[PDB]
Amino acid sequence: GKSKKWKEILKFPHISQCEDLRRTIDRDYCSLCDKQPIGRLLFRQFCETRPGLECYIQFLDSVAEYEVTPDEKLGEKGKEIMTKYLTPKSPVFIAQVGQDLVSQTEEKLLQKPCKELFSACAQSVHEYLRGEPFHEYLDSMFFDRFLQWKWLERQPVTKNTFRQYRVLGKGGFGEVCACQVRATGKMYACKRLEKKRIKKRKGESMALNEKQILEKVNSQFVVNLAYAYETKDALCLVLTIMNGGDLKFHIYNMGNPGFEEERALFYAAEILCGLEDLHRENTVYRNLKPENILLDDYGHIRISDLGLAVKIPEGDLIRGRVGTVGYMAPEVLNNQRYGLSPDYWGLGCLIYEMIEGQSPFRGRKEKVKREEVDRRVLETEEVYSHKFSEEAKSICKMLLTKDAKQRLGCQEEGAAEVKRHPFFRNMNFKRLEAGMLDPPFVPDPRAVYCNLDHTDDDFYSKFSTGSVSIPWQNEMIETECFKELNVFGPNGTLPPDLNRNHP
Ligand SMILES: Cc1nc2ccccn2c1C(=O)Nc1c(C)[nH]c(/C=C2\C(=O)N=C3CC=C(C(=O)N[C@H](C)c4ccc(F)cc4)C=C32)c1C
């Protein structure tokens, strides 16, 4: 349901309006052709025109399909690619991957199959595209079209850019509504942080820390920031919408309480990928509890409440003693200097709670005081039941190691060490990260699951940076606004908006 005049809101500017953009955007190949969705599509579209580049795009697509292929169907897919791209007499031949690597790839086909068989060829193809093809695309009309899309991206976001529907939750500094972008009709989750209370509580820095952390990470399994704007009475964070409920509700109201080990495996695998994406930024979450894991319309999960996340400088440690009683790692309860370890402790808490239907250190049917709960966390070894396989027991007690130094995932390897644990032995993380594995529970669509200081002005400005680049471009693509507006001249000619004559 896009606005009636949406083709006028997202109307392309004349290319003459984008010269300031042309000369400031860093001409980085990975950024302009891969990281940014619309740039990636436009570069691929450019390669579609030249006959020599089309084959390389098709090959990369087939390698992307190969890496997520089922294990027992690997050799079948690999040989196909070989007969189509790596054969010298093929109509679609990869010429820049010389024979000195075609032969190596054929040796691996003569041997076992690995999901990274075509990694060498794919990187060689990329090493070729970053050269002449990329610099030709920079002087092509498709990069001028990309500049037009960036011009729209940088436009100012106001309250009139969205329309709010209903209030879906309350919090500490404000509330959470459900807004929609009028021009594209995409739903979001508005997070109103009301100004008066931020300045009274002197928690300005925390709002910027959460906003910056949210706009940085671009994970499939953490709520993403799409817009950060300001109104006459609040600061708004437009985040991913999650209508599927929260994991606490499904553990206790929908559960046994608890899930089957396989169901918990799926949710744990997605939470681990979320924590991994966060730790790629040396950002620790510290707020892992079942109610913070939200489900979407499809059944997948994301980590939601980033109000307690902070970015650890590389090589640094921090102090805190923050979180929720029962989900605080011993190093946090002791108020020590820690790194990312609280999140792996939380992952242990989550896996245990999903399988067993209660926290590892307090019973569902137990009336205990915070003092005793903490004492158990610091001194008591959790017990396990027949609901846990041996692998499930293993990963849980390894993640629940009191000594953050010996805790799983807290080595130089990081989340890698966790993905390798035998508890995920039957989990294909490549397919999971690609959204290829079916979630174990799909929420029903219709379901309902539940002043003049001027220093404030400077704070206003650094917060409200506007639309976030990758989420914005993805929004454009999903709502099909890109497919509709991204039209050129008939038969490869220039459209009027891209011709510097007759502006
Ligand atoms: C299915 C259904 N039926 C009913 C019936 C009645 C009521 C609800 N529902 C739902 C339901 O799930 N609603 C819902 C939807 C769609 N999204 C969310 C929340 C989020 C979302 O999507 N993305 C983030 C990111 C980050 C947060 C987050 O940090 N929150 C904390 C506490 C917070 C801190 C400070 C604040 F000022 C405000 C909040 C929350 C969210 C909720 C709660």
UniProtKB/Swiss-Prot annotation:
The reaction(s) this protein catalyses: [G-protein-coupled receptor] + ATP = [G-protein-coupled receptor]-phosphate + ADP + H(+)
Major enzyme class: transferase
Indicate the segments forming the AGC-kinase C-terminal domain, all copies: 425-475
Annotated GO biological process: adenylate cyclase-modulating G protein-coupled receptor signaling pathway; apoptotic process; fat cell differentiation; G protein-coupled receptor signaling pathway; negative regulation of apoptotic process; positive regulation of cell population proliferation; protein autophosphorylation; regulation of cell cycle
Q: What is the effect of changing K365A?
A: Nuclear exclusion
Cited SUPFAM superfamilies: Protein kinase-like (PK-like) (SSF56112), Regulator of G-protein signaling, RGS (SSF48097)
Query: What are the residue boundaries of the RGS domain, all occurrences included?
Result: 29-147
Q: How is it modified after translation?
A: Autophosphorylated. Autophosphorylation may play a critical role in the regulation of GRK5 kinase activity.
Q: Which PROSITE patterns match?
A: AGC_KINASE_CTER, PROTEIN_KINASE_ATP, PROTEIN_KINASE_DOM, RGS
Where does tissue-level expression of this protein occur?
A: Highest levels in heart, placenta, lung > skeletal muscle > brain, liver, pancreas > kidney.
Q: How does it assemble?
A: Interacts with ST13 (via the C-terminus 303-319 AA). Interacts with TP53/p53. Interacts with HTR4 (via C-terminus 330-346 AA); this interaction is promoted by 5-HT (serotonin). Interacts with HDAC5. Interacts with GIT1.
Function, in words: Serine/threonine kinase that phosphorylates preferentially the activated forms of a variety of G-protein-coupled receptors (GPCRs). Such receptor phosphorylation initiates beta-arrestin-mediated receptor desensitization, internalization, and signaling events leading to their down-regulation. Phosphorylates a variety of GPCRs, including adrenergic receptors, muscarinic acetylcholine receptors (more specifically Gi-coupled M2/M4 subtypes), dopamine receptors and opioid receptors.
This chain's protein is named: G protein-coupled receptor kinase 5
Q: Which organism is it from?
A: Homo sapiens
